[PDB]
Design an enzyme around this catalytic site. Structure first.
Site, PDB file in Angstrom:
ATOM      1  CG  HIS A 169       0.959  10.347   6.924  1.00 45.90           C
ATOM      2  ND1 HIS A 169      -0.053   9.629   6.310  1.00 45.90           N
ATOM      3  CD2 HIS A 169       0.641  11.653   6.765  1.00 45.90           C
ATOM      4  CE1 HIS A 169      -0.941  10.472   5.813  1.00 45.90           C
ATOM      5  NE2 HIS A 169      -0.538  11.709   6.072  1.00 45.90           N
TER       6      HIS A 169
ATOM      7  CD  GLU B 139      -3.643   9.590   2.882  1.00 45.16           C
ATOM      8  OE1 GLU B 139      -3.268   9.486   4.068  1.00 45.16           O
ATOM      9  OE2 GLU B 139      -4.276   8.689   2.289  1.00 45.16           O
TER      10      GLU B 139
ATOM     11  CG  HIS C 264      -0.447   8.473   1.910  1.00 43.13           C
ATOM     12  ND1 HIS C 264      -1.236   7.344   1.944  1.00 43.13           N
ATOM     13  CD2 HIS C 264      -0.039   8.696   3.181  1.00 43.13           C
ATOM     14  CE1 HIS C 264      -1.312   6.909   3.196  1.00 43.13           C
ATOM     15  NE2 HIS C 264      -0.592   7.709   3.963  1.00 43.13           N
TER      16      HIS C 264
ATOM     17  CG  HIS D 201       3.307   5.776   5.728  1.00 41.50           C
ATOM     18  ND1 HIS D 201       3.009   5.583   7.062  1.00 41.50           N
ATOM     19  CD2 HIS D 201       2.237   6.405   5.192  1.00 41.50           C
ATOM     20  CE1 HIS D 201       1.806   6.063   7.315  1.00 41.50           C
ATOM     21  NE2 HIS D 201       1.313   6.568   6.192  1.00 41.50           N
TER      22      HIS D 201
ATOM     23  CB  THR E 187      -5.549   8.136   5.872  1.00 35.58           C
ATOM     24  OG1 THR E 187      -4.253   7.616   5.569  1.00 35.58           O
ATOM     25  CG2 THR E 187      -5.427   9.423   6.698  1.00 35.58           C
TER      26      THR E 187
ATOM     27  CG  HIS F  81      -1.836  -1.165   1.315  1.00 37.06           C
ATOM     28  ND1 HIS F  81      -2.856  -1.391   0.416  1.00 37.06           N
ATOM     29  CD2 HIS F  81      -1.876  -2.191   2.197  1.00 37.06           C
ATOM     30  CE1 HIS F  81      -3.488  -2.505   0.741  1.00 37.06           C
ATOM     31  NE2 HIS F  81      -2.909  -3.013   1.814  1.00 37.06           N
TER      32      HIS F  81
HETATM   33  N1  LIG Z   1      -1.879   6.804   6.838  1.00 36.38           N
HETATM   34  S1  LIG Z   1      -1.831   6.668   8.485  1.00 36.38           S
HETATM   35  O1  LIG Z   1      -0.694   7.366   9.039  1.00 36.38           O
HETATM   36  O2  LIG Z   1      -3.051   7.225   9.063  1.00 36.38           O
HETATM   37  C1  LIG Z   1      -1.741   4.959   8.938  1.00 36.38           C
HETATM   38  C2  LIG Z   1      -0.812   4.499   9.868  1.00 36.38           C
HETATM   39  C3  LIG Z   1      -0.799   3.121  10.169  1.00 36.38           C
HETATM   40  C4  LIG Z   1      -1.714   2.261   9.544  1.00 36.38           C
HETATM   41  N2  LIG Z   1      -1.770   0.838   9.757  1.00 36.38           N
HETATM   42  C5  LIG Z   1      -0.910   0.067  10.606  1.00 36.38           C
HETATM   43  O3  LIG Z   1      -0.022   0.552  11.297  1.00 36.38           O
HETATM   44  C6  LIG Z   1      -1.173  -1.431  10.611  1.00 36.38           C
HETATM   45  C7  LIG Z   1      -1.974  -2.064  11.779  1.00 36.38           C
HETATM   46  C8  LIG Z   1      -2.621  -3.373  11.368  1.00 36.38           C
HETATM   47  C9  LIG Z   1      -3.256  -4.066  12.570  1.00 36.38           C
HETATM   48  C10 LIG Z   1      -4.285  -3.020  12.780  1.00 36.38           C
HETATM   49  C11 LIG Z   1      -3.709  -1.751  13.188  1.00 36.38           C
HETATM   50  C12 LIG Z   1      -2.792  -1.895  14.367  1.00 36.38           C
HETATM   51  C13 LIG Z   1      -1.756  -2.934  14.155  1.00 36.38           C
HETATM   52  C14 LIG Z   1      -2.289  -4.219  13.686  1.00 36.38           C
HETATM   53  C15 LIG Z   1      -1.044  -2.194  13.055  1.00 36.38           C
HETATM   54  C16 LIG Z   1      -2.993  -1.197  12.200  1.00 36.38           C
HETATM   55  C17 LIG Z   1      -2.626   2.739   8.613  1.00 36.38           C
HETATM   56  C18 LIG Z   1      -2.640   4.096   8.310  1.00 36.38           C
HETATM   57 ZN   LIG Z   2      -0.367   7.602   5.969  1.00 38.31          ZN
END
Ligand SMILES: NS(=O)(=O)c1ccc(NC(=O)C[C@]23C[C@H]4C[C@H](C[C@H](C4)C2)C3)cc1
Ligand SMILES: [Zn+2]
Length: 257
Positions: free
Chosen positions: A116, A103, A93, A91, A195, A61
């Site tokens: 992010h 985003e 986007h 990471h 997100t 992703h």
């Molecule tokens: N774009 S953002 O910064 O808002 C963002 C950041 C991080 C994630 N996902 C994760 O870190 C994966 C994970 C998968 C399962 C479920 C939860 C908790 C644990 C186990 C880690 C999430 C998604 C979006």
């Molecule tokens: Zn992000």
């Protein structure tokens, strides 16, 4: 499973993740004229001098640069936050074109990409616990525009060849995330969510006012990554952003006037 295509993209997410239509979803448009200056907002405290990066991973992703978060080594404090938030990963986007990719938007303006830096509240013990709390995460969001190269980004750009496809990882030690920050730490802040699925409503968003500039060659290399795994049909990893969601009953606060 979910993704960013016509058949599994953001318009579809709510079927597996009904919180997609929740009360504090991210990202949002930041309307600069409606944001409220809050003079009691504290300066951000970014303490990354002891940061220990470990690895870079293509997860299908985006790509994540992961850090050792088993001690208070790289932490975010202050701003709207109480307590200590540890850096776990960063990471990006990004878009298929320079005019889209971020985003968050600012007065409906889209940037080429968005960084992010993801942190979790140490009072919850681990990241998995933290995402289950309304104040569990703090994500520092930084816009990227195309212009001059960002020297501190280049080591990330250099290793992308090694993690072209989903599931690939490479050692990525001794990277200094301070080289990704703009000069000013003026910010907007609001309560929001992850997100991407599972879209959990656990994030205090802190979005910096000042974008960083990256070169055309740097963002072009982001666009050569693949969503797919090796030996699967090639799908370029581009446009891995969720569009702005309704603000609903939220006010965006500004740390500056
Ligand atoms: N774009 S953002 O910064 O808002 C963002 C950041 C991080 C994630 N996902 C994760 O870190 C994966 C994970 C998968 C399962 C479920 C939860 C908790 C644990 C186990 C880690 C999430 C998604 C979006
Ligand atoms: Zn992000």
């Amino acid at each position: 499973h979910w993704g960013y295509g016509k058949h599994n993209g953001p318009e579809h997410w709510h079927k597996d993740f009904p919180i997609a239509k929740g009360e504090r979803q991210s990202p949002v448009d930041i309307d600069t004229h409606t944001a409220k200056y809050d003079p009691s907002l504290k300066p951000l405290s970014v303490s990354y001098d002891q940061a220990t990066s470990l690895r870079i991973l293509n997860n299908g992703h985006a790509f994540n640069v992961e850090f050792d978060d088993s001690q208070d080594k790289a932490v975010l404090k202050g701003g709207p936050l109480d307590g200590t938030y540890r850096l776990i990963q960063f990471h990006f986007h990004w878009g298929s074109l320079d005019g889209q990719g971020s985003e968050h938007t600012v007065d409906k303006k889209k940037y080429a990409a968005e960084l992010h830096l993801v942190h979790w509240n140490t009072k919850y013990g681990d990241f998995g616990k933290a995402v289950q709390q309304p104040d569990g995460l703090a994500v520092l969001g930084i816009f990227l525009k195309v212009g001059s190269a960002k020297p501190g980004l280049q080591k990330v750009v250099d290793v992308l060849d090694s993690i072209k496809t989903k599931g690939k990882s490479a050692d990525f030690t001794n990277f200094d995330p301070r080289g990704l920050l703009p000069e000013s730490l003026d910010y907007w802040t609001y309560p929001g969510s992850l997100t991407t699925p599972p879209l959990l409503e656990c994030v205090t968003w802190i979005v910096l006012k000042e974008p960083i500039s990256v070169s055309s060659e740097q963002v072009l290399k982001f666009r050569k990554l693949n969503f797919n795994g090796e030996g699967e049909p090639e799908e370029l990893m581009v446009d891995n952003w969720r569009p702005a969601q309704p603000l609903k009953n939220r006010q965006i606060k500004a740390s500056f006037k």
